[PDB]
């Protein structure tokens, strides 16, 4: 499960299917009147995704939006093809506008030099903490949950089946990880939006959490069980509390091992 890897695509809930790699999440949210893809993943993957999208009986002319978490080469790589293929707007976070736009990270990055670059992308502009994108049927809550990316986005919606709604949550990274020439340490205010972001997630309405690396919340085994028993499988609203616990945990054993 390489991030630039092939996946066949397949439905989470409702209109939410999964049409990323094997090690990276995308998602597309589907309606008749245009789709929302969320991440690009890497840039060879841009081909991965576009297939996939393709292969659900969807056109990549009704994608009209591609919205990032956040700006490093795993989730944002492809980003760019699928926008010149599509001919989609790509929305992020304000802080992650320029690095979407030029495909370079800002020295503020923990990842700064650590991820090599990735290519720039047309089309990009800023979305705000709060913010409700619409495209037709479909409305989708951008959340600032910033910490590993100054502009990192999780991405929040609803999707029905069977009349039955339920509240979808695509969840950015909240790891405290960088390069090794990189201290969390000397950055607090860095350190203080890993902590708003954990709150922010724990408290979000969440039945379904895809996150942005999707074994973060076990995907190939719900999507195995799911098998079994339906989409069901996906369903667990204490996935967010998890991730942030997680994120929260993470960021204990990394200022751990910088002292
Ligand atoms: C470094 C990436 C984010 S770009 C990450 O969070 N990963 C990479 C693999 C697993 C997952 C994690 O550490 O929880
Ligand atoms: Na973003
Ligand atoms: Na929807
Ligand atoms: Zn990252
Ligand atoms: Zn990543």
Redesign the pocket.
């Given at each position: 499960r390489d991030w630039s890897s092939p996946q066949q695509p397949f439905t989470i809930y409702?209109?939410?299917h999964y049409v990323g790699t094997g090690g990276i999440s995308a998602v597309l949210?589907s309606?008749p009147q245009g789709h929302i893809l969320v991440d690009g993943t890497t840039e060879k993957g841009a081909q991965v995704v576009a297939a996939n999208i393709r292969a659900m009986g969807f056109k990549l002319s009704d994608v009209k939006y591609i919205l990032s978490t956040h700006s490093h080469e795993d989730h944002a790589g492809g980003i760019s093809a699928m926008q010149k293929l599509t001919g989609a707007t790509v929305l992020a976070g304000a802080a992650n506008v320029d690095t979407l736009r030029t495909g370079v990270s800002p020295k503020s990055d923990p990842q700064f030099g650590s991820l090599s670059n990735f290519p720039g992308s047309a089309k990009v502009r800023a979305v705000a903490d709060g913010e409700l994108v619409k495209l037709g049927?479909?409305?989708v809550k951008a959340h600032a949950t910033p910490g590993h990316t100054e502009g990192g986005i999780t991405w929040t919606?609803?999707?029905?089946e069977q009349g039955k709604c339920k509240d979808?949550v695509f969840a950015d990274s909240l790891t405290a990880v960088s390069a090794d020439s990189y201290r969390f340490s000397d950055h607090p205010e860095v350190v203080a939006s890993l902590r708003g972001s954990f709150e922010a997630v724990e408290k979000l309405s969440c039945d379904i959490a895809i996150a942005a690396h999707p074994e973060v919340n076990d995907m190939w085994t719900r999507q195995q069980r799911a098998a079994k028993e339906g989409n069901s499988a996906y369903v667990d609203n204490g996935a967010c509390r998890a991730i942030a616990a997680a994120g929260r945990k993470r960021l204990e054993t990394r200022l751990a091992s910088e002292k």
């Open positions: 409702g209109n939410t949210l309606s049927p479909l409305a919606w609803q999707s029905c979808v």
